[PDB]
């Protein structure tokens, strides 16, 4: 309840926020990166499956 | 006005990350984390106010609808870059626009809503600030925006 | 620059696997699966952009000529096992090359371009979970590339 205190509090909330935001955005990018590779490899497995059964297709 | 479809999607994403079992709630304890992860900078006091205005019951949880209200509310009252800069200059003896990295750490951990040593360390790390240097807080504020 | 005879033949072969009638089209919903079978790893957003570019219907179809055109531009080659490994590391708390199977599941189905439970179960299923419910994620890095 005073100028030094308020000034400090305004700074602390901005830092606390920025840190968490930064970590969040980062976790988000990482998730998307893992997600595209997951979708990528499962699709390749599926296509392999199709290739395998096409040969058997008469 | 009110939250856009896009903003709603953004907040549900983060909210659902902390909603441990998809039941539609997050603990009142982590309301700050979620709001912060989404880019809002509330004080520990405001957090406690928001909580109070929803946790009379004492269950200690918050649902998505109220969370969206808190977000829209808090969003209306957002500090500018200059307001943050000004906060810095009260600790900026001579109006040069800098502040000892040592002084900063002292205020962060001793005044207001005292940061942890871990949080101050993290700050210095993530901001690539010289532990024994000067912080061009005008830029530091830009960096955090 | 453009697709060589070899590439065209490779792509036609891949595309044709998903062409049920031999009529020269693949459903819009399978565009991603087809690019993926050719080695690419596009995001959901990139796909939606490509689809919108040629004004296709989400419940509609895409043809070989436009497919070829998409592959000529949109096909990239920047991936590497390094980036997928760093992506997992972001969630490696102890830094010892492991992650919680349950945390991976929760993050993957809520954050970002979320996967369905089946997709994650398929992914986890192919890895060995140990006593502390953790996984050596280099197992995923290996099988995803």
Swiss-Prot record, chain A:
Tissues with expression: Detected in melanocytes.
Stretches assigned to the IQ domain: 4-26, 27-51
Signal peptide interval: none
Function: Processive actin-based motor that can move in large steps approximating the 36-nm pseudo-repeat of the actin filament. Can hydrolyze ATP in the presence of actin, which is essential for its function as a motor protein. Involved in melanosome transport. Also mediates the transport of vesicles to the plasma membrane. May also be required for some polarization process involved in dendrite formation.
Family designation: Belongs to the TRAFAC class myosin-kinesin ATPase superfamily. Myosin family.
The protein's assembly and partners: May be a homodimer, which associates with multiple calmodulin or myosin light chains. Interacts with RIPL2, the interaction is required for its role in dendrite formation. Interacts with MLPH. Interacts with SYTL4. Interacts with MYRIP. Interacts with RAB10; mediates the transport to the plasma membrane of SLC2A4/GLUT4 storage vesicles. Interacts with FMR1; this interaction occurs in association with polyribosome.
Name of protein: Unconventional myosin-Va
Native source organism of the sequence: Mus musculus (Mouse)
Organism phylogeny: Eukaryota, Metazoa, Chordata, Craniata, Vertebrata
Positions spanned in the full protein: 763 to 820 of 1853
Swiss-Prot record, chains B, C:
Modification sites for N6-acetyllysine: 20, 93
Residue segments, region Necessary and sufficient for interaction with PCP4: 75-145
Residues carrying N6-methyllysine: 114
Pfam families, sorted: EF-hand_7
Free-text description of this protein's post-translational modifications in UniProt: Ubiquitination results in a strongly decreased activity. Phosphorylation results in a decreased activity.
SMART domains, per the entry: EFh (SM00054)
Phosphothreonine modified-residue sites: 43, 109
GO cellular-component term (any): Schaffer collateral - CA1 synapse
Main location: cytoplasm
Domain topic, free-text comment: The N-terminal and C-terminal lobes of CALM bind to the C-terminus of KCNQ1 in a clamp-like conformation. Binding of CALM C-terminus to KCNQ1 is calcium-independent but is essential for assembly of the structure. Binding of CALM N-terminus to KCNQ1 is calcium-dependent and regulates electrophysiological activity of the channel. The C-lobe interacts with KCNN4 channels in a calcium-independent manner, whereas the N-lobe interacts with the S4-S5 linker of KCNN4 in a calcium-dependent manner playing a role as calcium sensor and gating the channel.
Name the record gives this protein: Calmodulin-1
Native species: Mus musculus
